[PDB]
Amino acid sequence: QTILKIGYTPPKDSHYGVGATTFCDEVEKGTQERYKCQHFPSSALGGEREMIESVQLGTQDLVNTSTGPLGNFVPETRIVDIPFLFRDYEHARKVMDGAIGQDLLKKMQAKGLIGLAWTENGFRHMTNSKRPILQASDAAGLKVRTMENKVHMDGYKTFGLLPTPMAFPELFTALQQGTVDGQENPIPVILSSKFSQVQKHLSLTGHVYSPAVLILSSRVWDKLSEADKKVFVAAAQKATVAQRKRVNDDEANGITQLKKDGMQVVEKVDGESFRKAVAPAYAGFAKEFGAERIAAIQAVKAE
């Protein structure tokens, strides 16, 4: 078999690992051993920005990545990074799976990033080591690491937070040394990366939805038979299901485990305060993405 390197930032025992393994197993069977994965979890091939760059260049075969730094390569994808755009998992998943999400995959493909299917990272939540976050004003003044994403940076600034973009593999040490007070990630990431060791506080702010996506290099895609192309896509859609299931499991059980680990969890925040804070940034978001595209997303699964 041709060995395809698949990288991701979480450990193998994670939502992304579940997605990668499901995808890889289906590709290996579906292509009758023409292709087989070798996994590189825990940023062995670098963080997400570096990995996507390598996939676009062809020097890395596959990545399971959040949209965080993806917008650097395909700016249209940042529409899904807008804070409080999505209402819940049903809403977000339907958008990603429907025509809107499918169009974003094609926009990626035009830039040499063969997005096979949207998987999932999850709704992101704020952690810090200084104080509980009950309302937007409690976040003001905190230094918080963000992903390498201008929409997150601009959006989160409206909460009064002071953002610093950092690649994921540098995050644990940054939190440990106090370079920043906090960060934000889905429960699946907080669990699998043991941030409980260096963050005392968690608030279920659910401030953005973080999709993930299995991306193949155009170098490899263009060498595939038309039949194998179909196998890769089908395999990635099976991965979507397994990965979301693991997200679901992580959330149902994760809060209890994080509490046992010593985290102080705020389960009900003043969501209105955060939504009101970010509203002014929608001027910029609409100018960039189109108010009608924002509205099209909001309309999906709405009452």
Ligand X SMILES: O=C(O)[C@H](O)[C@H](O)CO
Instruction: Please enumerate, by residue number, every residue annotated as part of a binding site.
Output: 16, 48, 121, 124, 145, 185
CB closer to ligand X out of 31 and 192: 192
> Between residues 42 and 217, which has the closer beta carbon with respect to ligand X?
42
Q: Is 175 in the site for ligand X (CB under 6 A)?
A: no
The interface with ligand X within residues 238-277 (CB under 6 A) comprises none
Q: Does 147 bind ligand X (CB under 6 A)?
A: yes
> What is d(CA 231, CA 220) in angstroms, rounded to the nearest whole number?
14
CA geometry: angle 191, 50, 228, nearest 5 deg: 90
Residue showing tokens 């102080």: 264
CB 188 within 8 A of CB 255: no
Q: Pick the binder of ligand X from 23, 84, 168, 195 (CB under 6 A).
A: 168
Under a CB-based contact definition with an 8 Å cutoff, are residues 44 and 51 in contact?
no
- Report residue 212 as tokens: 């993930």
Asked if residue 187 lies in contact with residue 265, where contact means CB atoms within 8 angstroms, the answer is no
What is the Cα–Cα distance from 121 to 137, expressed in whole angstroms? 27
Instruction: Name the residue number minimizing CB distance to ligand X.
Output: 66
Task: Measure the CA–CA gap between 185 and 203, rounded to whole angstroms.
Answer: 11
Site for ligand X in 85-144 (CB under 6 A): 121
Let me know: does 76 contact 104? Beta carbons within 8 Å.
Answer: yes
Number of shown-chain residues binding ligand X (CB under 6 A): 12
Q: Give the contact letters, 60-89, x = binds to ligand X (CB under 6 A), - = no.
A: ------x-x---------------------
Q: Would you say 212 or 242 has its CB closer to ligand X? A: 212
Q: 64 by DSSP, 3-state: which?
A: strand
- At closest approach, how far in Å is the CB of 42 from ligand X? 11
Question: Which residues, numbered 192-211, are part of the site for ligand X (CB under 6 A)?
Answer: 210
Question: Within 10 Å of residue 279's Cβ, how many Cβ atoms?
Answer: 12
Task: Determine if 9 is a binding residue for ligand X (CB under 6 A).
Answer: yes
Least Cβ distance, residue 29 to ligand X (angstroms)? 26
Report, in Å, the least distance between residue 297 CB and ligand X: 20
DSSP state of 195: G
Q: Which residues are annotated as a binding site for D-erythronate?
A: 16, 48, 121, 124, 145, 185
In angstroms, give the least distance from the CB of 286 to ligand X: 25
Nearest to 196 by CA among 257, 284, 137: 257
Give the binding site for ligand X (CB under 6 A). 9-10, 48, 66, 68, 121, 147, 168, 185, 189, 210, 212
